[model samples]
Target chain A: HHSGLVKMSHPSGDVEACMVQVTCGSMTLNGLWLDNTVWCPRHVMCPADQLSDPNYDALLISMTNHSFSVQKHIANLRVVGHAMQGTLLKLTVDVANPSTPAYTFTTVKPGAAFSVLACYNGRPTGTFTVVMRPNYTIKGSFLCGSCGSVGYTKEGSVINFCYMHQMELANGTHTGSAFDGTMYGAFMDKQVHQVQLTDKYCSVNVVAWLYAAILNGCAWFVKPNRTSVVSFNEWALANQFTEFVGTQSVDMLAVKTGVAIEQLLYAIQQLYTGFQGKQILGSTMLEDEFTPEDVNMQIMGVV
Target chain B: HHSGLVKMSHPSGDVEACMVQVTCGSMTLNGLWLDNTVWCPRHVMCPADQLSDPNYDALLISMTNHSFSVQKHIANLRVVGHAMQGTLLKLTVDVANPSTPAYTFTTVKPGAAFSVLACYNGRPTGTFTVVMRPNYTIKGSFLCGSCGSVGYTKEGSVINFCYMHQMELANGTHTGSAFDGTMYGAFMDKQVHQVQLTDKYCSVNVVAWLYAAILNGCAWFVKPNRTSVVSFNEWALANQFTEFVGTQSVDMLAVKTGVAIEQLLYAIQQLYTGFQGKQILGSTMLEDEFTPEDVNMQIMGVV
Candidate 1:
């Protein structure tokens, strides 16, 4: 089924006719095919150039060979997804060269760092500039402090901060109207906690991690800072997606700061991984040295 | 690797010894295994008088022969949901039955119908029903006249309709907050025109047909009616996702009517296909033939 013709030219200045042979023994050869006209190599012993002509000084010789009847196989990789966006896409292809090798690997092409987002009330949009880590593992952290709707983290702070401004706006008029600002703000803050708590509270620093990732990831999902009512957690859960989150909107100061701190932690984890066993940060105080009252704070000031 | 034992009584009815020979080869001889002890069929041979007598008094003497061995080669089919919507879904399977005669087909359980809806703004909803048809085809149709922002055709009408309440609302609220009722109404009316024009717009409709088929083929990427804004033309030129246009938003009359029309059309199509190419509405004029003037009058009356 498979055949090839090997025609060799001698290194000498002058050359004699060379015999052609095929490697695949199973292939049936009716007659030798030299150029366009088919010929039986046995009858045409030296029909074409039995010897090369040596022109006065230099000499040149040429040889042509072809396969009479043979079947050739080809293999190729096909690209798909002229549209749509996701972590993995469907790509159907026929395997003609199965004997070779098959593998699944990631490409560094910018195309790999993109995700598409489709909201309930809008058309699907493509977002990019995201970094996809292996096995979907992401690193982030939480900040502890007492503050307003946006948490304040000073050196040596202890209380876990609850940022209210970085929260969803409740049913309030967009303009000047008799709105309960504080209550609304508090409620907004509570909603973020509720969303984070309900969706990912079990993981110690998951809320901050999710917030940072979504903020970062949104750079590609939609026009940066064009906020959607549905949070990234809600959207990802709905679509069964989990990827990078980024920094963008900071309507609520504390949440944005929390996300920033989370990013710092992620960077630190990266460093830890790069250095393997190196110690990056050291603890200066004993764990049982302080009580809850030492870190407790009221509305405006620390205790 | 596979072996089992078989025993039987002799022809005398009173004689006990009976032989069982494997067609291929015996795993044991006498009480000894031909191969390894753990791998044999463990044969047993006993003398006469040990055989039990039959309860029937008119029994005729006959020799009992049998053979047994273990079989490790078997086949299995594992079905899984690759993708799905409310009423329509794609189910795939991992087939392992080498001799199972490929191309065996199965349909979704009968008598049950799935409700596929194109919902918008958390209110208006258009519904479609899907059921299995012959040759692995899933036949379905809309339940209403409007699918989200798209319109529908009726049984005896000329000129299909369009539903564009969102467009109207957006246009009306462009400036003053008093909610321009007149412009809003006009916008809604024009929305009908836009949808109708889109379908009858010659070039646009041609593209819509191709895109819709492609999108519909991938059932999960259903158009998010009110929530997302997607150009009918763009979808066609690229991936061709037109069959997805449907109506929703329970508060919108057009959405409700659209849902109803979709149901009607589905029923009509089902009946037509039931008899293998029989017509549902014989000699009926298609909705496309109606003039704009006639369509305007009908819209006024219907809305």
Candidate 2:
């Protein structure tokens, strides 16, 4: 049932945000977490507090009375991850961290999932170079035994076993890592990805494209024509994916997405470079957004 | 269209198994690949050769007139991966390796996804530990421009960008790795996981459970009551998942899947152990099976 509210006895200040899971019709609604009160973009209606949700894709969609539907249907809800990185690079820190109070967690609003870096071992840290699926998990009142990995100062912790980094370090030595790391360390999130995430321009440029790509991957699983209103693929193309691929297809993605060299360049750079983590995070996002049609014009170029 | 025939003018022996994507109604179909022939467990009608398709989930479903529908309308289709691991640790090798003629290419027939290991560098090797999502890609006539990466002797090849191993090796040294390794090396697929995959017992015991967990994960995203036939969760529970969880929910999965301590032990062991790779590979599987319901009796004790 759509409680429309993610309630608890007393909302623990320990938890900040969560990228939980819920179902709308047959497809999974990928967004919905944080602030106890369940606010979904796919919801028929949202509380005033929901407006603050960075995951306002569906909510943004409904704002326009287009015939399309964002509020699919909610069913069988559960928490998958406690943190919402990738999308909101920074954490919506309603609470502070006990481990390292100087470093407030619930830090970094979603921004640079790929470009930002997280480390398992900060003993030897460097700059630049990004990795994918770094170690994660912090914050929360996980009473819903049905939720996910329990959290604590050390005892109950949940890591994204989905992508793990080999502790290939030399006994006591720890190395900087990418994407998801379990080592418990500091990261470039605050400086790079997280800060950049707040910039709406990058959101429209890169983040939007990444969402499109994520949606594109989801579209891969979908039967094309079966989509009632707009298909995910078309939606992705609208949002700026496949910016360039086939000779003709590259041209296809090129023409489809419209930006020739620069688009493909960013796509390739972000993809082959530090962005693979973003791809995984983007995929995670779909497991949780909104309308796509509004993206066509934005697919071009910013500068 | 469910061509049911993965056709290419030249049905290259270079291709064996591929994990591709397609659409069924509105949901995405996770399995379909290789043999230049289209065959799926979700198809209504398949070719004579499709029966040979190890991806026999849906096809197997139709055999038992159980009022369920495995023929979930096929929509958009595309290839995702060239090899099928985890479920079938061994490759269904149809061709020989051009570089190493001494060793056959297209080896291993999908088995032991987690137990089996792959590496990028074999210079210095050891065994036992496992990694998740090792680098992969070999064998195929990738005519489908829309398919995955291209391949060749040295200048060309395909690799699973999904999971990558950082070249943490000391310069030229390639450590024995697990799951997917892009360094381009050899593996233990022949001995452990692959060989065991041929044995039907593991399939019923572990593989079946993995599939159920996968379906369970997929079910998380699906609107429960919306299921027209047997819901994915009920199906997974029927198969062998949630053998134990919740003080009672563990019992729920336990009662739901009906297995006691042993079940949870195996589940927990397989999960925390080298099997994390298997979980990932299993998640990949939902993108591609047949049915559930045939396992209630099998959930007890394997011993």
Candidate 3:
């Protein structure tokens, strides 16, 4: 008999429940779900507010008729037109808890170049792309080689240039904090790896070290009943493992292992937030409140 | 030498009023005031309240599909269509002023059958068609012809079909204080001469009569400015007139007028309301309330 079935009595003594086991590491949910860990819970509940809440907001995906940031979140996230010379992918994420956030990391499939937006202290910084790999390990010490035409708000609230320009704009004197402590300083030089798994019930778990932190902290998370590692490999292959190599060094090993840079960043963001008590990845109004009368009085008095 | 020109002195002053006239007759604010008649003090101000109000509340002149009435106070009237069979036309109106509302009588240029609708003791009667030429005079005894089809209703409210049916539906007994002691009726039975005016403001005076007191009060009259006249001739020429001559004494004068029947009907409805009382034609809901509801809800439904 398969070691997958176990019978048990309910705590009320009047009811009973059955536990089933499978040989496969993970069972697929409706063909759309991909999980890479041992089965545990049958379902993970995701609240309506959490499911609809935006994980990424106001990313500068692209700009029209102008040389813009190939790696800007808002301007680059959209499908690039023929005018775009190279592909740039940027994603911003909000992870509620970093310590147990579940996720996966894999490089874009071969021939693809990608980068990410890292939020630290409520601001994006250390803009980097996927780089080198070692003995089965992914690395992240990639700097953009050339700065391209970019547009930015005068107050620097929004940066809309290439990967290099974005990095430069965010490069402020590092104020050591729990989320971006000394460890992250050195870690930022090394590419990270992660594997995130969200199950049928939406129970999320991180397969590897990096993504677990981000997945756990996010408002939406599902624990999986069954998962298999191979799906993560497929995801990496689909994205193309090529690195943004002009100024960044890439690891061939990471590509072969299907390690993604975004996944690693997502993991780090989640982990940092969990370690520190803060909401670093959401909309910011840029100022405290002022009454309408106060504003009118201010303007009139000033004039 | 000029009979059309006339001069009159104001009772209060030496200053005289010069009246410019036309060959047929000049138009004035009152019901086709005759130039030869002694000028009376303006006792009737064309009933601004009536002209400005609609037959029913909310019946907007702007919203009308097509409206052809005598210019605000002009007595001239003409009706023509562009498509489909439009031989049958009808007119139902309540004269607000008891002073004889008279209309001249004339067939379309080539002559066409016409009919009239009048209410006797608040009950509708006299559905007659002017099929014969000499018989076209209002003094000629006539019977109102029952429309071939009157029971059809489309989508609850939108009136399709032709005026032939609409006459029967409208003539049916309705209870309420008839606004005026007199209600006039008119109908045409065939498509005759057609005229196309390039000018947007093309207009013509119509000859009709007030069929009252069993023809005892037979008097030729012109429509007040803005009274609508149905034109089967124009419709037949525009829509390709199709004549069906029947052997039965009861003639079915359904001739193709080049104009679409719906277009003609819409125009007639607009002009009809223009003369009845602007307030009556103002809104369909208001008209419906008076037509069916015993309570004059529009005027008294404040609570």
Candidate 4:
């Protein structure tokens, strides 16, 4: 059995009701995360004029005797590109509370490797492995990474993040407050890691990411097979970035992802906003700050 | 008889074939506008090392007894919007040198409104009108207003401007030397005006221009009936611009125009580079430059 104190705060004058849920194995825990009566000092810190009645700040819930074991399934993984330095992999995973009876799957193992079978266009590609990082909470019911979150449903299906949220993220209006407190605990991990699983992991979401990558000129299709890869050099990346942005790359990505062109484009836009923030990255501006060669080098890892 | 002393200068060390023609009334005149020699002082003005063997500067053509008259046909035009202030119109025209005998389409009047029978989804919509702007060119073949030029061919058709010229225009590298001396005078008066005739209008290229306009966010469909119109206000224009840039607008435009999506996107890119240059326009950068509301006001008439 695991127990913890969970608290949440709302923006001042926000009258909306809020709830938080915790999934532990087969048992699901729900609590009123926000109530109108609780006065959070954070909201109180703002000017008096900013506060409104029937608006509450914080919700604190003490969860006890909860047996929860969340597991992340490497849902999809694949190699979209073979770079000169390393292979580029796209990975998608589903983090779920398993349907274990009683207290069996209650405690999530601290440092298990998240593994998935990789494939190329539905064929077995390779196994991909990433060490499970500390868990995190999503606003509403979606999931995200250090970059940002895209929405997924209870049935383990992925959906687009809200357009309003997307605009906020793209414009950098998101305060990052939506992710108010830590949920992952001491199991925090890094994003970059060495190859643990063999290279075969792929997902439609990966295809979306690749489209964004291609538009920004961080990746390209190369060689005889035209396999897409992250550009090795900045010069090529910079040149290709300019060439790709306003081209038919989005359409190409739509075909690959089996998503409508509009949906695919929106996905790419959201990802780009998440990655680059409000600022136009790379050569969008910056006249003489960096040369093509320099940009290429920088984008290699960052892109 | 229209005669003029036409001369053109090339960027240093650049070797490219160049020609100039004039159409007057029932006569077509062609001239050897450039030869291998003619060391233009402008080329010398550049640092010496930049000069190359194949690079010759100026071309002098003595166009004599050339009876030339050029005319524009409002190949297609329609109002994609009906704003409170005024209707927003999308105008596309074809400039023709109609003095060829075998074609029998000889003669062009000095000043007449270029008119076209407008249509919505192939059904005749309304008669459209636009007085030909006095200054226009086809980049390598003709000149234009401050906006630069896109190329058109003789079969009453439009073709893409030269790629080399497009790159120069997009990068702001074109020095306007291509129209050095006298290409627009007696040689120029021929580019404006119209036929007031009916059978000569063409289609394929008009579709291309429409595609370009749509991609640039200047035009969109307004109703279930699919009435396409130019976005009048900057807010709508900017919003649509953002929506269209990386979306299936290209694919959609391709279907409407019967051009391949790749080709359509490439055509729009060239046009965008020609119009917006290489810079990120509007609020891509600049924190407080112009709000969506303000931009909408400005783009209304201009776009």
Candidate 5:
């Protein structure tokens, strides 16, 4: 049911016209069906011209199910990182069917590399690589439905989980007392007693507890939900993150803990749930009383 | 022509060498010419090692034709269902110059899930998933030289033209039986009754009669002709249920009725005759089959 007018300019400087029709689901030029005929605009006779143009030889006609036209089908290729140490690499592939898009996401695990090759009309073109940087933060929370956990971790390395919560003194302290008193025979003597101790304990247990709860919970959930984890990673990898106190604290905690940092961060964000504070020692506040930023500042001391 | 050498080392530091070559009209690694420079006792000469050590990086190189090396290459991904419980899913993808091997035989269609991520030059990597599965079978037969008639049918789908000839047991009792029967029913009943009556009515029909006369008459003159209906599903899907008296009965009559099985088989076979029955099927028979068994059994399945 498609019809179009094809105008042809002859070498003799005369322009001729041919009616192209698609009827009963087949293409025909004038009255003849074009099936199996050599494909070219000039293959058919333009009654006015009465001759085919040799210059039209530049284009070849190929027939597909519904239409007769000339075109080149191109292949697509791609490179990806399952994980990366920095800004996720992103590369664009231009073609008809792009199975994967042209960008690297934060969810990609560092050190995990992948690539794709696509074919057009059955032949493969060139391969594409994902562009990435050596350092980048995954924007948004890695854990499910949560935000503000330090999202940086050294690829392939482990860190202590309790490092930040351990006590350490900023400086030293001294206590002294003096009193006059009579001592025995030879000489009445008075003495003073003094005691000094340096260093004091520090605890950001509230922050540590929050992280521990999140990490442990996320691990439990991810163990059985591989698909969801993959989805989360994809989402995480696709986006970029700037900064939030939650993530800053998470990083500091990792620095202190000395356990595997990435694993812990992954676990915490994945397992995050609405907070319910009762037993842990700290200034207690309900979920509505503080924003993630507020909590980040409280734990890290500075945003 | 292509040629190369490979070296191997034993636990005791003993080295052995094997020469490989690829020759024209024959494809072999030894005959295969590997392209690209840099081959060494190890390709890169390590100045630290002044002496060439046989045990050190035993390697080789080869080359191929220009068209082979520079062509835009392609890789194909296929997802198939060997069997389905409902609705046969049929998907056909056509393109030019499909690289990789061409054989959609028994090795495919297993209920296993796998996806591939290709990498090129150690940097370009991308993941590609085939958009397929659940209810699919190739519409046409794999072998050439024949057309029409349901080439074969599995339990879960319908096909055009040759559907009925593809045998399957529907509801046990031949589809004829009681009540109204059918044009719709009376037609159904009559057909069943006729089927029930067929053990005695089996005949070389008139067309069959013409074939019988031609076959027997032709056989009398030439002394040979053969017609073989291959259950290609068997070769393609791989398995067996030899000669149901019914199928055997059907084929026997076809033989008696005259349309040459071995000749059809011969047309199939001679078309295959050049192929030799053993190697690729639809053609020749070779020593490879017995050797395959000997090798398999020798390695694992038990010789």
Candidate 6:
């Protein structure tokens, strides 16, 4: 279920496939790649190549005419996290086709509030009320107060934005991006809301628009099944500040993942190549190649 | 028991103590320092300072006469590993005293033969049977035949040798130290065993004399409580080739270990200092100081 590959058998008995992505309205659902060809809904303007395959017309039409397991779009895209201020918005998603694993966070923070978007583009179709933090003190505060799509990175770093430059963010306390993105843009007079922070941060369940697009729509996407999300500091300690995972031992890795060494290496190479295509998300040269040594495991303890 | 410090109450309310290292009867037991003091068994000519605090004379006598809980030496020190050819020797230590967590490998590979040294200065006290593999092929071979002490690093690389002037290793084959020590000595004719290896390796459990010194008898020593030992290649892949334990997250580490952040940082400093003392064990400049970032976590994946 974690994979979004759609398979189609060719007349020659060669099975072909395609990773699916949906750019319906303003949604950007990503369930992508393999050796397969890609396809999309009958109606939709394919973006530039980097965004998706511009030449999907043939694949789309052929698949539509019949004879292939169509790529399923995400239905109830669920996420989990806490918000510092304001109320969280919960949503319901519509999936034309559904798959197992139903797009949910593998691990959950007990009682942590989560919201979903049944919204197409930026318009909400359904919603739910957020429960108050049973008499919790507000140490820090942030508010969309009429905001656009919020975003979150793998570490759950929140990316926020004001709806349309509504109000000045002040207590005028200060706030920064979850991943250290800037809060104050040059055009401040018409900022959306006046946000304040006890500290520059508050554990929030917010994100920038890319993820926002997926969560709030009839799109398809797949994310890594990470164990859990924690502050960078907390994660460091949890992992003992020692992340010993590299291709240093191909044989060992093959045994651990239950695969052939040769094929595993190939898969890693494929994985790295796909990673490069998402360069907009911010990656570095360290990931330019797919060598066993090129893994991004940080050296955290004294060797 | 993992800690080597022996506590002693001073005439004053504050308790003083020392880690004990017994250079007894040709042995080296290392339970050493902190703010307190170090003590040896009253009558041994201590080596140059770094090996230990030569100033232990006063503490030694005071402790010997009546002071505190004396440091217990390693008793019946057991180790587990396999050798390609020769039989593993079992060992017995005259620990005069004892401690919990009696040294033992936490995990064991089934049917993996191991040897112990009951030998006090290369002399044996007791013995055990090494069950041979019911049916195993001799892919490669190695032997001490007649060698001095052997040593092993944390990752279990083997070190080998032969007695004075053995045969020319040919039919013979290629060989390297478990940790890459040389097999051929300029004094070849004087070698004890002509060790021939299949592929320069045969999964042997051999160590250079340093570890051999600890294993072979009355030597008091302390080794890290590592989870398991594997080849460099195996360990790297098993740990995902990424080591992420750095001072980067002090608060997190404190929380993980259930200690006060302030005290934890101090303990780390102490630990690093101790690490430096063993500089003869091949550490590098990267560990000169103790800082959150000074940890040797390796970046192993495409991050």
TM-score winner = 2
Q: Which parts of model 4 have CA positions greater than 4 angstroms off?
A: A1-273, A276-303, B1-58, B61-284, B287-303
Query: Lowest summed lDDT over 10 consecutive residues: which window, candidate 2 chain A?
Result: A1-10
Task: Give lDDT: candidate 6, residue A85.
Answer: 17
DockQ of each: 0.01, 0.02, 0.00, 0.01, 0.01, 0.01
Q: Give lDDT: candidate 1, residue B190.
A: 23
In model 4, how large is the Cα lDDT of residue A258?
Answer: 43
TM-scores, all candidates, are 0.13, 0.21, 0.11, 0.18, 0.14, 0.15
Candidate 6 or 5, higher TM-score: 6
Where model 2 places Cα greater than 4 Å from the true spot, the runs are A1-303, B1-101, B105-303
Candidate 6 lDDT over residue span B1-303, tens digit each = 001001100010000111133243332423222222222222232233322333433423333222222242322222122111111111122232221211211211212222211112222111111111111111111222212112111111121111111122433221211112222222122224433322211111111111222222312223332322233335434422221222334333334333333332232223333433232212211111112211111000000
**Candidate 3 - CAPRI tier?**
incorrect
Off by over 4 Å in 3: A1-220, A239-303, B1-303
The candidate scoring highest on lDDT is: 2
Candidate 3's residue-wise lDDT over A1-303, tens digit each?
011001100011000000111111122110000121111111111122332322211212222312211112111212222121112212111211122112232322222222322221111222222211111111222122211111111111111211211111121111111111111122221112222111110001121212222222322221222223344334434442212221121222124234454444243333423433233112111111111111212112111
Compute fnat per model: 0.00, 0.00, 0.00, 0.00, 0.00, 0.00
DockQ of 6: 0.01
- What docking tier does model 6 reach? incorrect
Residue A58 alpha-carbon offset, candidate 1, angstroms: 99
How many residue pairs in model 2 have overlapping backbones? 78
lDDT of 4 at A21: 26
lDDT of 4 at A222: 15
lDDT of 2 by residue, B42-82 (tens): 22223334423434344333433222121112122232222
The B-chain TM-score of model 6 reads 0.17
lDDT per model vs. reference: 0.19, 0.24, 0.19, 0.21, 0.19, 0.22
- Shift of residue A164 alpha carbon in model 1, Å: 23
